[PDB]
Amino acid sequence: ARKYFVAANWKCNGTLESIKSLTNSFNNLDFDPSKLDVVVFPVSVHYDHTRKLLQSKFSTGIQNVSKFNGSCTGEVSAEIAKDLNIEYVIIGHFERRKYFHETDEDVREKLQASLKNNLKAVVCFGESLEQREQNKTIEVITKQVKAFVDLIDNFDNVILVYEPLWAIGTGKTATPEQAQLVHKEIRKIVKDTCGEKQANQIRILYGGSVNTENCSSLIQQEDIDGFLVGNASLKESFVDIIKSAM
Amino acid sequence: ARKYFVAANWKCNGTLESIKSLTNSFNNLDFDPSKLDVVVFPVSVHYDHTRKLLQSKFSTGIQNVSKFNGSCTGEVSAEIAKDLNIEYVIIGHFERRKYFHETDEDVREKLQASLKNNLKAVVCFGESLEQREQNKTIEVITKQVKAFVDLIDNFDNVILVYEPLWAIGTGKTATPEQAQLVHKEIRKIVKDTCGEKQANQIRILYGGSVNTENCSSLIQQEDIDGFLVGNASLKESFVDIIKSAM
């Protein structure tokens, strides 16, 4: 029933040439975009090069958007993104929260501005290692998800991403069972706050050191609908991660 | 002699169409780029469009660059900028210091990263209303400039910008004499730390509500070498500001 979603997140990475080579390899995979969404999130200044090189089957997005007051924070606004026809934005990703102290309240506000401007939003959340050790995973996730999920209107256009912070960029990936357990709870939170039909439509991705070895067991899980992929998305074998969802 | 430098900074705005019409009006101005530097700093995702539309006599740049640490901050790196042939970078601009708590040490590091990658740097600093009311202007400026000025190597490639914070975006522009007095003291810091020849070469710009009515009286002052212009640089009349420096 629900369409899988696989996303590449190219984080502070790339040159004109490396993108050229990588896009060409991605373009060599045949998949049907009416069946599978595949989205690439390049560095801001590489967005146009990247969109120009990727075939229309690939969707594209940017990695952050501002809240939404006149005083310019130097982030890209949702209005600017719409005018450039940028289809997706990421919100709440680890680095915004870690370096820029972005809050749950900021996350909500960003989702508001994205939806107001007809952008599709990939909204990220997850617990720290300490929180997981302190047996606080569900509490954390619950608070993070309920900061924004009632704003969701069309449940094809907001994608939730569970990324435990300890898995991001570390090679330490969640087991399928660790992930599933959290996704199952996330979908229940959507059910209880937005309705059953909506909870069953919305995509909930895992991210955190997803690779060609582990992707099949993850996606097999029933409440895991695809992935946000960092390091592994910089290599040509990313195509095999996409295939895991085909 | 010392080459004048006028910069447009387009803060969180534009659309594809507004840039088309604005760049067109700019391109109608005949000036000699061997005699006058004119740099346009668009939003990141508008860099490509803007650069394609502006004639070669305009230089271009980005509004921020990251420090050199394995966990990506989402900012564009100096390396990426060089690979894109982005000529200039702004460092230390007010929003970074205010919204993201960017420090003088951060500014030093960004300058180090920029020069390591052959980027030319437009380095901004300035006091608050409170600091100025508390007679601390010269002390504040001095700490800010001494944070990085020693790293300067080629004194054509780093440009200093005095923007008192109370003048930025407010309409409340510094008088010629307010700015001149600071500019003299900046240039002396440079003479004392870097050498007299170097101090006479470096450009020191004023920014903070420069407009078509005030720009002539500012540029006339001996130690003001140009401008960084926000709100006024979104209008077709910005050409008249460039003309005050021709």
Side-chain angles (χ1 to χ4, degrees), chain A residues 1-34 36-66 69-70 72-81 83-93 95-97 99 102-104 106-115 117-133 137-142 144-187 189-196 198-200 202-212 214-221 223-246, chain B residues 1-19 21-34 36-66 68-93 95-115 117-129 131-134 137-142 144-145 147-190 192-195 198-221 223-246:
Chain A
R2 67 188 162 264
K3 197 169 181 193
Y4 282 170
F5 189 112
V6 178
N9 188 23
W10 294 345
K11 293 184 288 206
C12 299
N13 230 278
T15 61
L16 295 176
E17 270 310 313
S18 75
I19 287 172
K20 171 161 202 237
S21 170
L22 188 57
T23 54
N24 177 247
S25 87
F26 286 9
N27 280 338
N28 284 333
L29 173 71
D30 289 306
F31 66 99
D32 178 1
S34 62
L36 179 57
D37 290 319
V38 184
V39 190
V40 172
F41 291 90
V43 175
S44 65
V45 291
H46 289 152
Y47 182 89
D48 275 4
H49 178 66
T50 299
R51 175 66 287 173
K52 188 151 285 151
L53 289 165
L54 286 165
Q55 292 173 1
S56 53
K57 57 197 179 187
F58 292 100
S59 309
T60 48
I62 60 178
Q63 292 167 344
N64 181 54
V65 82
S66 67
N69 78 346
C72 166
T73 67
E75 301 162 288
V76 176
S77 69
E79 289 80 0
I80 282 162
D83 172 79
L84 266 162
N85 289 310
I86 293 175
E87 187 176 5
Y88 293 88
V89 293
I90 305 176
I91 304 168
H93 201 258
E95 80 282 343
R96 300 304 306 183
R97 296 173 194 265
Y99 293 109
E102 177 164 305
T103 60
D104 282 338
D106 296 317
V107 169
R108 183 193 183 76
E109 246 203 278
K110 292 183 173 195
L111 180 65
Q112 272 196 213
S114 302
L115 298 184
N117 288 273
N118 301 135
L119 299 182
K120 301 176 172 153
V122 176
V123 189
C124 298
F125 47 86
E127 84 287 355
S128 77
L129 186 62
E130 172 162 283
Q131 285 164 348
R132 179 131 206 140
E133 274 154 9
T137 303
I138 293 302
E139 185 198 329
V140 180
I141 260 64
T142 295
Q144 292 177 316
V145 167
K146 283 188 182 172
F148 65 77
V149 74
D150 54 289
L151 301 174
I152 301 175
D153 209 313
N154 174 325
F155 282 75
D156 302 340
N157 290 349
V158 186
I159 295 85
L160 307 180
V161 194
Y162 171 44
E163 310 194 279
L165 304 190
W166 51 260
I168 296 173
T170 60
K172 307 310 171 185
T173 149
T175 66
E177 294 89 1
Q178 286 173 321
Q180 176 57 21
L181 214 43
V182 175
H183 285 225
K184 188 149 197 63
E185 190 57 26
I186 293 158
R187 197 173 303 275
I189 296 157
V190 185
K191 157 154 143 240
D192 303 346
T193 125
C194 313
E196 181 135 76
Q198 295 97 317
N200 288 328
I202 200 180
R203 280 77 68 79
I204 307 167
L205 314 183
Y206 169 80
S209 304
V210 165
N211 67 41
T212 56
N214 63 35
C215 52
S216 308
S217 288
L218 282 160
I219 189 71
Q220 167 178 56
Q221 295 292 304
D223 292 275
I224 296 182
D225 301 319
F227 311 116
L228 186 58
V229 187
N231 216 270
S233 77
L234 300 174
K235 298 179 181 156
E236 301 188 355
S237 50
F238 186 62
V239 300
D240 292 321
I241 300 174
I242 298 160
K243 285 170 158 180
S244 78
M246 279 166 76
Chain B
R2 213 152 64 235
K3 203 174 178 205
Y4 279 173
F5 187 109
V6 171
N9 191 16
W10 296 344
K11 303 179 286 191
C12 300
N13 77 299
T15 53
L16 290 176
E17 278 303 313
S18 75
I19 291 164
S21 79
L22 183 62
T23 57
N24 187 251
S25 86
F26 284 12
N27 286 331
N28 291 335
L29 175 66
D30 278 294
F31 63 100
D32 182 348
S34 55
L36 177 62
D37 292 320
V38 193
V39 196
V40 176
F41 292 91
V43 171
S44 60
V45 294
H46 293 151
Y47 184 84
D48 193 73
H49 180 66
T50 303
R51 172 70 284 172
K52 270 180 173 58
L53 289 171
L54 289 165
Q55 293 172 1
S56 61
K57 57 188 182 192
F58 301 98
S59 307
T60 48
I62 53 175
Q63 294 166 344
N64 182 49
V65 68
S66 70
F68 292 103
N69 65 4
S71 88
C72 166
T73 63
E75 296 166 285
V76 172
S77 67
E79 287 82 5
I80 280 170
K82 181 184 173 155
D83 178 74
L84 272 150
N85 285 303
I86 291 173
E87 189 176 356
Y88 287 93
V89 295
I90 306 181
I91 305 169
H93 206 256
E95 72 294 335
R96 295 307 288 186
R97 296 186 189 258
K98 177 186 176 154
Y99 297 112
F100 310 80
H101 320 294
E102 170 162 318
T103 70
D104 287 331
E105 297 77 28
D106 295 333
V107 165
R108 183 182 186 74
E109 261 207 81
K110 297 190 171 191
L111 177 56
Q112 186 171 86
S114 308
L115 279 335
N117 293 268
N118 303 123
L119 300 183
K120 296 177 180 98
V122 171
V123 185
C124 302
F125 48 88
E127 87 293 352
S128 69
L129 185 55
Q131 294 173 326
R132 168 172 288 257
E133 269 157 3
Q134 292 172 15
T137 299
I138 294 309
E139 174 190 337
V140 167
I141 276 343
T142 305
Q144 288 184 324
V145 169
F148 65 85
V149 74
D150 57 286
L151 297 172
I152 303 179
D153 173 57
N154 167 334
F155 284 79
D156 291 331
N157 289 348
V158 185
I159 298 92
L160 312 179
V161 193
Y162 175 52
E163 305 195 288
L165 302 190
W166 44 268
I168 292 172
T170 59
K172 272 63 271 225
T173 149
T175 60
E177 294 82 11
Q178 295 181 300
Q180 169 64 21
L181 283 166
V182 179
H183 278 226
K184 206 164 182 53
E185 189 56 38
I186 292 158
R187 202 170 302 271
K188 182 170 188 297
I189 294 159
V190 183
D192 287 2
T193 68
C194 306
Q198 289 76 25
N200 284 171
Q201 207 178 333
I202 201 166
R203 276 74 71 73
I204 305 177
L205 316 185
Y206 169 76
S209 311
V210 173
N211 66 36
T212 47
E213 279 65 258
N214 64 34
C215 57
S216 291
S217 291
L218 289 152
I219 193 61
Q220 171 183 66
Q221 295 288 325
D223 296 273
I224 307 178
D225 301 322
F227 307 123
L228 181 62
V229 185
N231 167 68
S233 77
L234 302 173
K235 303 177 150 93
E236 298 176 10
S237 60
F238 181 72
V239 301
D240 285 330
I241 296 178
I242 296 168
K243 285 179 178 174
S244 72
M246 286 175 57

PDB file of all heavy atoms in Angstrom, chain B residues 135-147, unseen atoms left out:
ATOM      1  N   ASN B 135      30.521  53.878  25.950  1.00  0.00           N
ATOM      2  CA  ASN B 135      31.845  54.298  25.454  1.00  0.00           C
ATOM      3  C   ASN B 135      32.869  53.175  25.222  1.00  0.00           C
ATOM      4  O   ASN B 135      34.043  53.421  25.396  1.00  0.00           O
ATOM      5  CB  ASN B 135      32.461  55.408  26.332  1.00  0.00           C
ATOM      6  N   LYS B 136      32.432  51.981  24.785  1.00  0.00           N
ATOM      7  CA  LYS B 136      33.342  50.839  24.555  1.00  0.00           C
ATOM      8  C   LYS B 136      33.658  50.549  23.048  1.00  0.00           C
ATOM      9  O   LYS B 136      34.345  49.562  22.713  1.00  0.00           O
ATOM     10  CB  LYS B 136      32.838  49.573  25.285  1.00  0.00           C
ATOM     11  CG  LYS B 136      32.732  49.711  26.824  1.00  0.00           C
ATOM     12  CD  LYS B 136      32.547  48.406  27.601  1.00  0.00           C
ATOM     13  N   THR B 137      33.233  51.432  22.147  1.00  0.00           N
ATOM     14  CA  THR B 137      33.395  51.179  20.692  1.00  0.00           C
ATOM     15  C   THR B 137      34.800  50.720  20.278  1.00  0.00           C
ATOM     16  O   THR B 137      34.947  49.693  19.604  1.00  0.00           O
ATOM     17  CB  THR B 137      33.002  52.400  19.821  1.00  0.00           C
ATOM     18  OG1 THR B 137      31.620  52.712  20.028  1.00  0.00           O
ATOM     19  CG2 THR B 137      33.161  52.077  18.345  1.00  0.00           C
ATOM     20  N   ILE B 138      35.834  51.459  20.685  1.00  0.00           N
ATOM     21  CA  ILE B 138      37.178  51.196  20.191  1.00  0.00           C
ATOM     22  C   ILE B 138      37.741  49.948  20.816  1.00  0.00           C
ATOM     23  O   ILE B 138      38.353  49.159  20.116  1.00  0.00           O
ATOM     24  CB  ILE B 138      38.118  52.391  20.353  1.00  0.00           C
ATOM     25  CG1 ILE B 138      37.654  53.554  19.455  1.00  0.00           C
ATOM     26  CG2 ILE B 138      39.577  51.959  20.102  1.00  0.00           C
ATOM     27  CD1 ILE B 138      37.405  53.204  17.998  1.00  0.00           C
ATOM     28  N   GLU B 139      37.493  49.733  22.096  1.00  0.00           N
ATOM     29  CA  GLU B 139      37.873  48.500  22.748  1.00  0.00           C
ATOM     30  C   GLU B 139      37.257  47.274  22.067  1.00  0.00           C
ATOM     31  O   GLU B 139      37.933  46.306  21.868  1.00  0.00           O
ATOM     32  CB  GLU B 139      37.426  48.514  24.202  1.00  0.00           C
ATOM     33  CG  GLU B 139      37.643  47.207  24.968  1.00  0.00           C
ATOM     34  CD  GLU B 139      36.953  47.203  26.326  1.00  0.00           C
ATOM     35  OE1 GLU B 139      36.681  48.278  26.879  1.00  0.00           O
ATOM     36  OE2 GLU B 139      36.643  46.116  26.818  1.00  0.00           O
ATOM     37  N   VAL B 140      35.946  47.289  21.813  1.00  0.00           N
ATOM     38  CA  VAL B 140      35.265  46.152  21.148  1.00  0.00           C
ATOM     39  C   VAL B 140      35.849  45.860  19.743  1.00  0.00           C
ATOM     40  O   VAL B 140      36.208  44.726  19.443  1.00  0.00           O
ATOM     41  CB  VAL B 140      33.764  46.452  21.066  1.00  0.00           C
ATOM     42  CG1 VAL B 140      33.060  45.490  20.127  1.00  0.00           C
ATOM     43  CG2 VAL B 140      33.160  46.351  22.460  1.00  0.00           C
ATOM     44  N   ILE B 141      35.942  46.897  18.905  1.00  0.00           N
ATOM     45  CA  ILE B 141      36.475  46.816  17.575  1.00  0.00           C
ATOM     46  C   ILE B 141      37.881  46.236  17.583  1.00  0.00           C
ATOM     47  O   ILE B 141      38.246  45.430  16.722  1.00  0.00           O
ATOM     48  CB  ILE B 141      36.524  48.258  16.946  1.00  0.00           C
ATOM     49  CG1 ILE B 141      35.190  48.653  16.338  1.00  0.00           C
ATOM     50  CG2 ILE B 141      37.645  48.459  15.943  1.00  0.00           C
ATOM     51  CD1 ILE B 141      34.245  47.516  16.093  1.00  0.00           C
ATOM     52  N   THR B 142      38.688  46.716  18.518  1.00  0.00           N
ATOM     53  CA  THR B 142      40.087  46.299  18.613  1.00  0.00           C
ATOM     54  C   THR B 142      40.196  44.789  18.902  1.00  0.00           C
ATOM     55  O   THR B 142      40.895  44.090  18.228  1.00  0.00           O
ATOM     56  CB  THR B 142      40.823  47.190  19.645  1.00  0.00           C
ATOM     57  OG1 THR B 142      40.658  48.584  19.272  1.00  0.00           O
ATOM     58  CG2 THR B 142      42.335  46.814  19.722  1.00  0.00           C
ATOM     59  N   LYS B 143      39.445  44.279  19.865  1.00  0.00           N
ATOM     60  CA  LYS B 143      39.465  42.866  20.190  1.00  0.00           C
ATOM     61  C   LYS B 143      39.039  42.086  18.917  1.00  0.00           C
ATOM     62  O   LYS B 143      39.659  41.094  18.515  1.00  0.00           O
ATOM     63  CB  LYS B 143      38.480  42.595  21.375  1.00  0.00           C
ATOM     64  CG  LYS B 143      38.221  41.156  21.839  1.00  0.00           C
ATOM     65  N   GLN B 144      37.986  42.556  18.262  1.00  0.00           N
ATOM     66  CA  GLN B 144      37.427  41.815  17.123  1.00  0.00           C
ATOM     67  C   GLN B 144      38.422  41.737  15.974  1.00  0.00           C
ATOM     68  O   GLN B 144      38.575  40.663  15.357  1.00  0.00           O
ATOM     69  CB  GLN B 144      36.104  42.444  16.665  1.00  0.00           C
ATOM     70  CG  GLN B 144      34.992  42.196  17.647  1.00  0.00           C
ATOM     71  CD  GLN B 144      33.621  42.733  17.184  1.00  0.00           C
ATOM     72  OE1 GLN B 144      33.498  43.774  16.544  1.00  0.00           O
ATOM     73  NE2 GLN B 144      32.602  41.979  17.472  1.00  0.00           N
ATOM     74  N   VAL B 145      39.104  42.845  15.692  1.00  0.00           N
ATOM     75  CA  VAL B 145      40.037  42.912  14.545  1.00  0.00           C
ATOM     76  C   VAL B 145      41.339  42.171  14.839  1.00  0.00           C
ATOM     77  O   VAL B 145      41.857  41.479  13.971  1.00  0.00           O
ATOM     78  CB  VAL B 145      40.350  44.374  14.117  1.00  0.00           C
ATOM     79  CG1 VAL B 145      41.492  44.474  13.117  1.00  0.00           C
ATOM     80  CG2 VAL B 145      39.111  45.029  13.484  1.00  0.00           C
ATOM     81  N   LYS B 146      41.873  42.360  16.045  1.00  0.00           N
ATOM     82  CA  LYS B 146      43.109  41.651  16.466  1.00  0.00           C
ATOM     83  C   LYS B 146      42.893  40.136  16.533  1.00  0.00           C
ATOM     84  O   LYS B 146      43.831  39.403  16.440  1.00  0.00           O
ATOM     85  CB  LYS B 146      43.684  42.216  17.811  1.00  0.00           C
ATOM     86  CG  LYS B 146      44.302  43.634  17.664  1.00  0.00           C
ATOM     87  CD  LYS B 146      45.181  44.149  18.824  1.00  0.00           C
ATOM     88  N   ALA B 147      41.662  39.659  16.696  1.00  0.00           N
ATOM     89  CA  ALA B 147      41.388  38.220  16.566  1.00  0.00           C
ATOM     90  C   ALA B 147      41.891  37.506  15.285  1.00  0.00           C
ATOM     91  O   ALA B 147      42.122  36.295  15.301  1.00  0.00           O
ATOM     92  CB  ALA B 147      39.902  37.912  16.795  1.00  0.00           C
TER      93      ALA B 147
END
